[PDB]
Amino acid sequence: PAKTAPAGGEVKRIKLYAERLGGGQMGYGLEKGKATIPGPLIELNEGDTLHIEFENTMDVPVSLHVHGLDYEISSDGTKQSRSDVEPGGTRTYTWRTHVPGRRADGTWRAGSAGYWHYHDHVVGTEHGTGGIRNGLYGPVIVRRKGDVLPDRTHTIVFNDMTINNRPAHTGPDFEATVGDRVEFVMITHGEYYHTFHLHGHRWADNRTGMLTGPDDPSQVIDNKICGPADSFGFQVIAGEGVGAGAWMYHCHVQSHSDMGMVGLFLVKKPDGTIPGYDPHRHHHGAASGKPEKAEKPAGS
Amino acid sequence: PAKTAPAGGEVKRIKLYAERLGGGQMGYGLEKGKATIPGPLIELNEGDTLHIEFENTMDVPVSLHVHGLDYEISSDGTKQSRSDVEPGGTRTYTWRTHVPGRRADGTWRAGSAGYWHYHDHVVGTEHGTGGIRNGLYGPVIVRRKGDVLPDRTHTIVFNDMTINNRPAHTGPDFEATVGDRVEFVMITHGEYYHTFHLHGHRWADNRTGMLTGPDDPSQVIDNKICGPADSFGFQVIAGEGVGAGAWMYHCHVQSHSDMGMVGLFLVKKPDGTIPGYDPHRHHHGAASGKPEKAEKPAGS
Amino acid sequence: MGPAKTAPAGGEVKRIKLYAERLGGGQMGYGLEKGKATIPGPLIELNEGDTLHIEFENTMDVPVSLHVHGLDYEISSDGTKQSRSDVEPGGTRTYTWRTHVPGRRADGTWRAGSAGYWHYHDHVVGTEHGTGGIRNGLYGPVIVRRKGDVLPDRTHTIVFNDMTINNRPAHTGPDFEATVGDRVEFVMITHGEYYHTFHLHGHRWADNRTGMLTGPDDPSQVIDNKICGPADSFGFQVIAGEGVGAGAWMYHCHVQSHSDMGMVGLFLVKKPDGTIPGYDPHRHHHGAASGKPEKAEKPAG
Ligand SMILES: [Cu+2]
Ligand SMILES: [Cu+2]
Ligand SMILES: [Cu+2]
Ligand SMILES: [Cu+2]
Ligand SMILES: [Cu+2]
Ligand SMILES: [Cu+2]
Numbered sequence: 023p024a025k026t027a028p029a030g031g032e033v034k035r036i037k038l039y040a041e042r043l044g045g046g047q048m049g050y051g052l053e054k055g056k057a058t059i060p061g062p063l064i065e066l067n068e069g070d071t072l073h074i075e076f077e078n079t080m081d082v083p084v085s086l087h088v089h090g091l092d093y094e095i096s097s098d099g100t101k102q103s104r105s106d107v108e109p110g111g112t113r114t115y116t117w118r119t120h121v122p123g124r125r126a127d128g129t130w131r132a133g134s135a136g137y138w139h140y141h142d143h144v145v146g147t148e149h150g151t152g153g154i155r156n157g158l159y160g161p162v163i164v165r166r167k168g169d170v171l172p173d174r175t176h177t178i179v180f181n182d183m184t185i186n187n188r189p190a191h192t193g194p195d196f197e198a199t200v201g202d203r204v205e206f207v208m209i210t211h212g213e214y215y216h217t218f219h220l221h222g223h224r225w226a227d228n229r230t231g232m233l234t235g236p237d238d239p240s241q242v243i244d245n246k247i248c249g250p251a252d253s254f255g256f257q258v259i260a261g262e263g264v265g266a267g268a269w270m271y272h273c274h275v276q277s278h279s280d281m282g283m284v285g286l287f288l289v290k291k292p293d294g295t296i297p298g299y300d301p302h303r304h305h306h307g308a309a310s311g312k313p314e315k316a317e318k319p320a321g322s
Numbered sequence: 323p324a325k326t327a328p329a330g331g332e333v334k335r336i337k338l339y340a341e342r343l344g345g346g347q348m349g350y351g352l353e354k355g356k357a358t359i360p361g362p363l364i365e366l367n368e369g370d371t372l373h374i375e376f377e378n379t380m381d382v383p384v385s386l387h388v389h390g391l392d393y394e395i396s397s398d399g400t401k402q403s404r405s406d407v408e409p410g411g412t413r414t415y416t417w418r419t420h421v422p423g424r425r426a427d428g429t430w431r432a433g434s435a436g437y438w439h440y441h442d443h444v445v446g447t448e449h450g451t452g453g454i455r456n457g458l459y460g461p462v463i464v465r466r467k468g469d470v471l472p473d474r475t476h477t478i479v480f481n482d483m484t485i486n487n488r489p490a491h492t493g494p495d496f497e498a499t500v501g502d503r504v505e506f507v508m509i510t511h512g513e514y515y516h517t518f519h520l521h522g523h524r525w526a527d528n529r530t531g532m533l534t535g536p537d538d539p540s541q542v543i544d545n546k547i548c549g550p551a552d553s554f555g556f557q558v559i560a561g562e563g564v565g566a567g568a569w570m571y572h573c574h575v576q577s578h579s580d581m582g583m584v585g586l587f588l589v590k591k592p593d594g595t596i597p598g599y600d601p602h603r604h605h606h607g608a609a610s611g612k613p614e615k616a617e618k619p620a621g622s
Numbered sequence: 623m624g625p626a627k628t629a630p631a632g633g634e635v636k637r638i639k640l641y642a643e644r645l646g647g648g649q650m651g652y653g654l655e656k657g658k659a660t661i662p663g664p665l666i667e668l669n670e671g672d673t674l675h676i677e678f679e680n681t682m683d684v685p686v687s688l689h690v691h692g693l694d695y696e697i698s699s700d701g702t703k704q705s706r707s708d709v710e711p712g713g714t715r716t717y718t719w720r721t722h723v724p725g726r727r728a729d730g731t732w733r734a735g736s737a738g739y740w741h742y743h744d745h746v747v748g749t750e751h752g753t754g755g756i757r758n759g760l761y762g763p764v765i766v767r768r769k770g771d772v773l774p775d776r777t778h779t780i781v782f783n784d785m786t787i788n789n790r791p792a793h794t795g796p797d798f799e800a801t802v803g804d805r806v807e808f809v810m811i812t813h814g815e816y817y818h819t820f821h822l823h824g825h826r827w828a829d830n831r832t833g834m835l836t837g838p839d840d841p842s843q844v845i846d847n848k849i850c851g852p853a854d855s856f857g858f859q860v861i862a863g864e865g866v867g868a869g870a871w872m873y874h875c876h877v878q879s880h881s882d883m884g885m886v887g888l889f890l891v892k893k894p895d896g897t898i899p900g901y902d903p904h905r906h907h908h909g910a911a912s913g914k915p916e917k918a919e920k921p922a923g
């Protein structure tokens with residue numbers, strides 16, 4: 023058992039659009055009218071090259087900038103590099119990815135693999151302050167050959183005082199069944215530091231969020247401090263050793279928690295019930311609505 | 323010939339009370355009228371189960387919630403899971419703990435071993451904001467079989483702008499003899515980020531705070547940023563390579579340090595001498611009083 | 623490409639002269655020669671086992687001290703009022719830092735070595751916590767090397783001190799110059815009141831002691847972005863432009879208002895012919911010019 027990532031090395035291509043959303047927001051999407059905050063999950067295998075055919079449907083300039091992946095200066099996505107996109111414009115951005123390996127100097131070159139993210143560098147200031155606040159950001163995952171694959175992947179972005187730009191106390195909530203292998207990508211943006219905490223679960227503070235084995239000294243944690251543009255990820259086995267229930271995740275800064283940065287990891291018994299939980303309730307005047315569906319990785 | 327932790331797997335039982343302390347404060351204790359801030363140190367061996375017979379001695383509801391350990395949702399310690407405790411009420415809380423090992427899918431399940439903590443989730447808000455502010459928090463240590471055991475353990479909690487809820491510039495101070503193996507558990511709570519620093523000593527930033535050997539890449543540090551609910555720990559040999567002295571520890575955020583988050587690790591020669599220490603001095607109007615005794619782990 | 627240069631065994635007794643002096647604008651700094659003080663102060667590099675005697679002289683009209691992180695020192699070298707190790711105006715003192723290799727103790731435990739990215743700063747100016755001294759610029763990098771550690775071509779020091787980089791005016795950089803392929807070391811230190819996040823475009827490093835993965839078994843997260851707070855220090859090395867190419871590669875704090883307010887600089891990575899595609903040097907940004915690139919630091923001789 024346990025599905026693992028294959029070798030990379032393929033040239034891949036997708037479309038991405040930036041568009042205005044309700045109420046002053048902006049998002050990236052895989053099709054016109056389909057933009058979401060966070061933008062679509064992009065998933066690659068080390069060695070893969072990705073050509074993103076990008077179109078800006080808005081009436082202001084926008085760009086696409088990425089952390090951690092290889093790109094040439096012309097793909098930086100900045101005014102400074104003349105890599106932004108005019109209103110109505112199209113540009114092809116290119117991201118590349120490489121495996122680890124020995125350098126001739128004897129050192130070991132780290133590969134591209136990790137939890138990363140992309141966002142706008144252009145809207146509102148030349149640092150993307152406006153774009154990021156408006157919602158233009160998304161997750162990118164690069165797998166090393168042999169990395170364990172999860173059943174589903176959820177993305178949690180602490181953006182200023184919001185989770186995924188949602189109104190306070192709206193979650194989101196994510197559904198799983200006890201035993202599911204579930205991946206979280208955790209990204210932070212804006213002005214503030216936070217601490218991400220998840221009830222009833224824990225992970226390894228390292229590249230994959232999972233210990234490699236008995237020799238891995240990495241601290242096991244349930245709580246992690248994070249600043250703007252930090253990203254990390256991990257996988258848990260839902261309800262492992264703790265059983266079903268509505269398991270809270272939240273920022274652990276006390277006022278942030280009280281002010282609505284909280285959501286539920288809803289872990290169901292095999293029969294679909296969660297012990298001791300009331301679904302349609304309001305919390306501080308707001309309802310979390312339906313659980314957010316897991317993100318499907320983009321294109322190909 | 324360093325002492326090491328034995329294998330776990332027992333069933334342990336303790337009693338725990340919540341009671342009001344002076345000045346709007348609240349604490350946990352092992353006996354009525356014995357509550358302390360921070361609460362008693364609880365120490366377990368990976369695999370141990372702990373039943374806590376909990377009694378709420380106060381006139382308002384309270385709860386007990388734990389990080390990192392295994393527990394069922396009915397032990398969550400929250401209003402939402404109906405696991406809180408009414409005034410004058412009793413409940414048994416159960417915490418469980420497991421060793422690392424291979425799963426059936428071939429992956430490696432991380433153990434519970436680590437530096438963790440427990441606090442109230444119900445007082446002042448359903449996030450425990452009031453309980454934590456008031457002092458209901460305390461350390462939990464889970465040892466992996468073969469972990470090095472210290473001579474003594476001290477707990478340092480940065481709760482908002484205070485150390486262990488003490489008035490500004492009161493320490494606490496901790497006392498050791500040169501060569502003692504001393505363990506510190508460092509927990510943060512409240513609204514603020516901090517950076518913990520200890521003069522004259524250093525530790526590995528990894529699960530146990532010690533390097534496993536020559537193959538551990540973990541950064542050796544004397545300074546660590548930490549946010550609300552962050553938990554870590556480490557051991558030092560007191561005065562190693564440095565000698566006796568009053569060795570300051572403190573938040574390194576400059577104003578926090580000036581405003582009183584500072585204490586002393588007082589390391590003595592066998593004949594008692596402590597260079598760089600004036601025992602009768604007040605600092606910014608306050609005195610640290612006598613050194614805090616090392617916490618002895620709650621007996622079963 | 624030959625095998626990288628690596629640090630030898632330490633164990634030598636070394637000695638330098640160090641001064642504190644006032645600089646323009648109410649600032650203060652450490653220097654290797656009178657009139658030569660810099661912010662940050664001179665880079666100090668040792669090999670594990672080295673002892674360093676710092677013959678220190680305060681040229682200022684107010685007291686000052688020298689305190690260090692991570693390195694072995696006796697209480698009389700603490701550099702604090704409490705330990706009576708501060709220096710009076712015109713005063714001199716010998717500060718001694720020692721350093722040790724890793725190894726097994728008698729108890730069978732492994733003692734961690736001194737090696738790492740560390741720093742020194744005043745502990746007595748403005749308050750007994752060195753709050754004024756640090757604000758004014760009395761701080762600098764210390765590197766301790768384990769035998770075998772890879773040595774870079776050049777080292778640069780980036781200090782986020784409150785809202786400034788190296789106490790420079792907003793939007794002035796500094797910028798650092800390299801050529802594609804150069805092995806470039808960064809020492810990154812934070813001071814003052816604020817948390818930040820350090821980010822470098824186009825490059826990445828391992829979050830661990832050396833900033834470099836030890837091999838295929840090292841689990842450390844590979845990152846381009848790192849949260850840091852007052853007195854934090856870490857370091858890494860990158861191969862400039864590796865897999866990416868020439869360009870003006872931005873580094874900045876990633877807290878949005880901080881980058882907007884000027885904590886930004888350029889890692890200027892030139893092609894072998896000395897040119898940078900699509901970049902211009904004399905621009906002003908938000909009213910300020912970054913001036914010429916910061917020359918790399920020669921470790922104190
Ligand atoms: Cu940027
Ligand atoms: Cu928060
Ligand atoms: Cu919790
Ligand atoms: Cu970014
Ligand atoms: Cu409603
Ligand atoms: Cu909680």
Ligand SMILES: [Cu+2]
Pocket residue numbers: 480515516517573574575578579583
């Ligand atoms: Cu603090």
Ligand SMILES: [Cu+2]
Pocket residue numbers: 519520521522689690691
């Ligand atoms: Cu220090």
Ligand SMILES: [Cu+2]
Pocket residue numbers: 219274389441551
């Ligand atoms: Cu908590």
Ligand SMILES: [Cu+2]
Pocket residue numbers: 604608609
């Ligand atoms: Cu008094």
Ligand SMILES: [Cu+2]
Pocket residue numbers: 521570572745751
């Ligand atoms: Cu200090």
Ligand SMILES: [Cu+2]
Pocket residue numbers: 782817818819875876877880881885
């Ligand atoms: Cu900043």
Ligand SMILES: [Cu+2]
Pocket residue numbers: 087088089821822823824
């Ligand atoms: Cu970037």
Ligand SMILES: [Cu+2]
Pocket residue numbers: 574691743853
């Ligand atoms: Cu310091």
Ligand SMILES: [Cu+2]
Pocket residue numbers: 906910911
């Ligand atoms: Cu000018």
Ligand SMILES: [Zn+2]
Pocket residue numbers: 279280284305448449
């Ligand atoms: Zn709530």
Ligand SMILES: [Zn+2]
Pocket residue numbers: 579580584605750751
């Ligand atoms: Zn003080």
Ligand SMILES: [Zn+2]
Pocket residue numbers: 148149881882886907
């Ligand atoms: Zn700018």
